[PDB]
């Protein structure tokens, strides 16, 4: 009953792995295929293999989770192969997401331009808001910068194309960046990345618990529902409808995906819940949303998807 | 061992409500004067009374709180009276701390002016980020407009003036931010105001909590620790020694207190758990953060203020 129409494809069930969490090398990639995952993507890239930031770099935290990765990846060329190999053995029903993060606007379009050369026919997902390397603030806080980006990609850049946000906090802010976005032929947005720059502190030995940055890095599970929700629904009130929207954030339970549908969110990624129980959770998400719309006597996601009352 | 220094003033303990939780009318603002808080500040206040949004606009959840209130309070004069009235009887050793929150640039400086022209001795605090008022974003996102306000209000303004501001997410907003403020004789900065515009949903139901904005509103406790803390650490290793802290955000135990004040924060304020606790939770909280200095061997703040570890 899950059955999922996104970018013009069909997918058995809406989830996803968010991207950097179980799809570093191919071995990741073709467990998350073996899952029961709808769908899957890519750890962003960047034109060169890099190692990331120095460890600890990643802590499981009782409400979530807090990263400074430093988008360690094995290069762009190391993914396009997979991908490409991938599409010609027709193993997989709905196409294969392609994350990419280049360090700067060059690089990006560096990438995009190689994408549109290809055969690949998936989907591509510009990550604007990496919060974790640094030197580099995120490009999505900048408006003007985002703007004159995407004018230039879609000069000529055909393929699907989803761009990856960081969550915003005021309503003027949606009501910018909706106006931005909807000039353009996008596929989708996905909302959220980790919040920016927060800080765990172990107490016992008075100091941060990562490496990377004087322990500042971004926060991701329970702690971020609320702004994930919000972000989703919001966007989801002001984006013309061409534009479909892919929900991340806080999602454990069966209950949290309900919750991203009902604000309007077609596809779900799961990131820290994922990190911490492994492809096995797919299985289990799936039989509890199920069983939520089962309970209500929902048939479909198209029964109550987007629709949130209000008071 | 809680004594603190702060604005050139003594305090018991550094512990205070936060703007907007118990200190609405004279008679919650005479429960927290019998606390055993350290200090407190009144409910920000604008010109003319206002009755805020429409109920339910608070509900109480398990990770925090979530409230759109819209600035409901008494108006300008009905705090200022109190707080001139309450400077005759020295019945309390320290200043008491008087919040504004002006709808317009011009409002605020109106509320400035006659704080400047009364015999007020306490501190002031310029609310520059309520996030829950429809149709008016959060000043301190604006950088050129904060700039511009204060360099009027300090064409005047010579007493003791802190600014509540909005979480930031990105290390060069702080930079920007810093660099802003350090430029001015202010007494202090108190981060952060709710992280604002979140969603919390009742699947149940399939709506949202509360009445106004549609279900947005300001998020606390719990959920925004990691954040809070983020927020006065990265303006501490900025702001120049003359300008101190206050911390709010996720406080509720002595080691949230016990954080706050590794990072850099002088002074304490707790909003949700008090809403939910009542004034007794001052009395626990610092027999907590007593405990934790006994066990640590420290007699004073001035011990670990500040001295969180990289690593
Ligand atoms: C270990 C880790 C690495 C991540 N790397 C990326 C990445 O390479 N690209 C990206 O767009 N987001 C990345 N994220 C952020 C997520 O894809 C997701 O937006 C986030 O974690 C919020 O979801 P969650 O609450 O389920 O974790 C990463 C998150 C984590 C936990
Ligand atoms: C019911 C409610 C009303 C609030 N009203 C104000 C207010 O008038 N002025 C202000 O500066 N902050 C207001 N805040 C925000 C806080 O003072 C504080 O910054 C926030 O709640 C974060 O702290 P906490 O995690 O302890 O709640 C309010 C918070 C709540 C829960
Ligand atoms: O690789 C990382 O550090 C990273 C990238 C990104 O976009 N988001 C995140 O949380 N981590
Ligand atoms: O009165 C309110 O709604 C309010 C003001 C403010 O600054 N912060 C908050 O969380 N609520």
Same mark, same amino acid.
């Given at each position: 009953?899950?059955?999922?129409? =996104?970018?013009?494809? #069909? /997918?058995?069930?809406?989830?996803?792995?968010?991207?950097? %969490?179980?799809?570093?090398?191919?071995?990741?990639?073709?467990?998350?295929?073996?899952?029961? $995952?709808?769908?899957?993507?890519?750890?962003?890239?960047?034109?060169?293999?890099?190692?990331?930031?120095?460890?600890?770099?990643?802590?499981?935290?009782?409400?979530?989770?807090?990263?400074?990765?430093?988008?360690?990846?094995?290069? /762009? @060329?190391?993914?396009?192969?997979?991908?490409?190999?991938?599409? #010609? +053995?027709?193993?997989?029903?709905?196409?294969?997401? /392609?994350?990419? $993060?280049?360090?700067?606007?060059?690089?990006?379009?560096?990438?995009?331009?190689?994408?549109?050369?290809?055969?690949?026919?998936?989907? !591509?997902?510009?990550?604007?808001?990496?919060?974790?390397?640094?030197? #580099?603030?995120?490009?999505?806080?900048?408006?003007?910068? !985002?703007?004159?980006?995407?004018?230039?990609?879609?000069? =000529?850049?055909?393929?699907?194309?989803?761009?990856?946000?960081?969550?915003?906090? @005021?309503? %003027?802010? /949606? @009501?910018?960046?909706?106006?931005?976005?909807?000039?353009?032929?996008?596929?989708? %947005?996905?909302?959220?990345?980790?919040?920016?720059?927060?800080?765990?502190? @172990?107490?016992? $030995?008075?100091?941060?618990?990562?490496?990377?940055?004087?322990?500042?890095?971004?926060?991701?599970?329970?702690?971020?529902?609320? !702004?994930?929700?919000?972000?989703?629904? $919001?966007?989801?009130?002001?984006?013309?409808?061409?534009?479909?929207?892919?929900?991340?954030?806080?999602?454990? !339970?069966?209950?949290?995906?309900? +919750?991203?549908?009902?604000?309007?969110?077609?596809?779900?990624?799961?990131?820290?819940?994922?990190?911490?129980?492994?492809?096995?959770?797919?299985?289990?998400?799936?039989?509890?949303?199920?069983?939520?719309?089962?309970?209500?006597?929902?048939?479909?996601?198209?029964?109550?998807?987007?629709?949130?009352?209000?008071?």
């Amino acid at each position: 009953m899950l059955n999922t129409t =996104f970018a013009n494809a #069909k /997918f058995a069930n809406p989830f996803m792995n968010a991207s950097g %969490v179980h799809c570093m090398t191919i071995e990741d990639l073709e467990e998350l295929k073996a899952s029961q $995952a709808g769908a899957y993507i890519t750890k962003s890239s960047t034109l060169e293999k890099r190692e990331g930031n120095p460890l600890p770099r990643y802590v499981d935290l009782e409400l979530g989770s807090i990263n400074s990765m430093g988008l360690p990846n094995l290069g /762009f @060329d190391y993914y396009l192969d997979y991908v490409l190999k991938n599409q #010609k +053995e027709n193993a997989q029903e709905g196409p294969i997401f /392609f994350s990419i $993060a280049g360090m700067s606007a060059a690089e990006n379009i560096a990438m995009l331009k190689k994408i549109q050369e290809s055969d690949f026919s998936g989907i !591509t997902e510009l990550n604007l808001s990496c919060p974790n390397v640094p030197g #580099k603030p995120q490009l999505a806080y900048d408006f003007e910068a !985002t703007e004159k980006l995407l004018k230039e990609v879609f000069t =000529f850049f055909t393929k699907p194309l989803g761009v990856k946000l960081p969550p915003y906090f @005021d309503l %003027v802010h /949606f @009501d910018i960046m909706a106006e931005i976005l909807n000039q353009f032929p996008l596929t989708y %947005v996905n909302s959220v990345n980790s919040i920016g720059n927060g800080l765990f502190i @172990d107490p016992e $030995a008075e100091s941060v618990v990562i490496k990377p940055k004087d322990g500042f890095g971004g926060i991701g599970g329970a702690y971020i529902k609320p !702004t994930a929700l919000a972000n989703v629904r $919001a966007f989801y009130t002001r984006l013309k409808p061409e534009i479909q929207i892919i929900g991340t954030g806080g999602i454990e !339970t069966g209950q949290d995906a309900f +919750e991203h549908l009902l604000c309007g969110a077609t596809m779900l990624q799961i990131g820290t819940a994922l990190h911490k129980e492994g492809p096995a959770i797919f299985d289990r998400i799936i039989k509890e949303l199920e069983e939520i719309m089962n309970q209500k006597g929902y048939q479909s996601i198209a029964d109550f998807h987007g629709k949130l009352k209000s008071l």
